[PDB]
Design a protein around this ligand. Structure first.
Ligand SMILES: [Au+]
Ligand SMILES: [Au+]
Length: 109
């Protein structure tokens, strides 16, 4: 529902070629996708513009029900710190940049 609602809440996102990527869980580095990813993130509560990535929620969305491994938290909290998200003015670009920290995780899952 989120994918389909986000393709409509984001301009350009309602696009047959992008949606092909999205369902195949591919997310190209382009301004439409940036906003689509931000939207998914906000809708699923995996993300927030001010507070950033919710690492526990993502841990869950990666097929886990326990408290996140300390490594996982330490790792990505480091990855996200190094991105200086607070200096990225465009919100879609900030969200897209945050979520690349977690890409290795999503892919190996
Ligand atoms: Au493509
Ligand atoms: Au962007």
């Amino acid at each position: 529902s989120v994918i389909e609602s986000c393709s409509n809440a984001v301009q350009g996102a309602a696009n047959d070629e992008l949606k092909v990527h999205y369902r195949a869980n591919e997310f190209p580095d382009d301004p439409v996708t940036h906003c689509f990813v931000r939207c998914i993130g906000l809708e699923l509560n995996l993300y927030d513009d001010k507070y950033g990535v919710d690492l526990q929620a993502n841990w869950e969305n990666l097929g886990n029900s326990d408290d996140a491994d300390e490594e996982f938290v330490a790792k990505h909290r480091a990855c996200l710190e190094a991105k200086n998200l607070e200096t990225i003015e465009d919100l879609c670009e900030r969200a897209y940049s945050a979520f690349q920290c977690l890409r290795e995780d999503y892919e190996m899952y």
